Design an enzyme around this catalytic site. Structure first.
Site, short mmCIF file in Angstrom:
data_model
loop_
_atom_site.label_atom_id
_atom_site.label_comp_id
_atom_site.label_asym_id
_atom_site.label_seq_id
_atom_site.Cartn_x
_atom_site.Cartn_y
_atom_site.Cartn_z
CG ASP A 135 -0.35 -0.04 2.50
OD1 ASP A 135 0.85 0.13 2.68
OD2 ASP A 135 -1.08 -0.22 3.51
CG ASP A 175 -1.10 -8.26 4.29
OD1 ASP A 175 -0.76 -8.73 3.19
OD2 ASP A 175 -2.03 -7.41 4.39
#
Length: 205
Positions: free
Chosen positions: A10, A116
Site C-alpha cells: 500500500d 500480510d
C-alpha cells in the site's frame, strides 16, 4: 505456531518505522516518494494528507533458491504486540498451495497469527498510499494484479518484488504456514536497518 497469510503493498510508512515502537537500534527505514531513504523517522506518513514517508522498495521479497526466500510482512502475533514483533524475524514454512514445504524468513515491519506479506501488486487496500506516492499502482484496489505481465508497468524499483509473486511464490493464494521466531539474518536488517535488542534470545535460521 501456525498462521495464515495475505499479501499487500500500500506504499504506507510501515508501523515499525516510527520511533519508540520496540527496543531496537533504529526503526524501520521509510522513504520519500522517489524511493530514497529518509533520515527523519518521525516523518509524516504518505498515507495521510500532506505526508511524505512511504514504504521503501527494497523492503520486498526475493528468492535465494527454489526452496528458500527472504522478505517482509505486516504481522499480528497472538499474545504479543508491536513491542515484541517490530523488527522481529520469523522463519515460515508454507503448509498449503504451490509453495507447500518451501521456507521464507521474514522480518516484521508493520502491523490471531497473521502475516500480510509485502508484495508489490498484492493490493493497496483501504489506505492506498501508492496513489499519492507516484499516481497509483496497477491492479484492483482490493486484490491487486492477477497476471505476471501486469508487473511490467510497475515502477522499476518495485518490479523485482512484483515478479517474485509469480516466479518463486508460484502465484500462491494466501498460503498457510507454520512459523518460529529467529534471530534476523543480516540480509533483512540490511534493508530495514532495524535490529531488535533481544535478537540474541532466539535461534538462527
Amino acid at each position: 505456531a501456525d498462521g495464515k497469510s495475505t499479501r499487500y503493498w500500500d506504499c504506507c510508512k510501515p508501523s515499525c518505522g516510527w520511533a519508540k515502537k520496540a527496543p531496537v537500534n533504529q526503526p524501520v527505514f521509510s522513504c520519500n516518494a522517489n524511493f530514497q531513504r529518509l533520515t527523519d523517522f518521525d516523518a509524516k506518513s504518505g498515507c495521510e494528507p500532506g505526508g511524505v514517508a512511504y514504504s521503501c522498495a527494497d523492503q520486498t521479497p526475493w528468492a535465494v533458491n527454489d526452496d528458500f526466500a527472504f522478505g517482509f510482512a505486516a504481522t499480528s502475533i497472538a499474545g504479543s504486540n508491536e513491542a515484541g514483533w517490530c523488527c522481529a524475524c520469523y522463519e515460515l514454512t508454507f503448509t498449503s498451495g504451490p509453495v507447500a514445504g518451501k521456507k521464507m524468513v521474514v522480518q516484521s515491519t508493520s502491523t490471531s497469527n497473521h502475516f500480510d506479506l509485502n508484495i508489490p501488486g498484492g493490493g493497496v487496500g483501504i489506505f492506498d498510499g501508492c496513489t499519492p506516492q507516484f499516481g497509483g499502482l496497477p491492479g484492483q484496489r482490493y486484490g491487486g494484479i492477477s497476471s505476471r505481465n501486469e508487473c511490467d508497468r510497475f515502477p522499476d524499483a518495485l518490479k523485482p518484488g512484483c515478479y517474485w509473486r509469480f516466479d518463486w511464490f508460484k502465484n500462491a493464494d494466501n498460503p498457510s504456514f507454520s512459523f518460529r521466531q529467529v534471530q534476523c539474518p543480516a540480509e533483512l536488517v540490511a534493508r530495514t536497518g532495524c535490529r531488535r535488542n533481544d535478537d540474541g534470545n532466539f535461534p538462527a535460521v
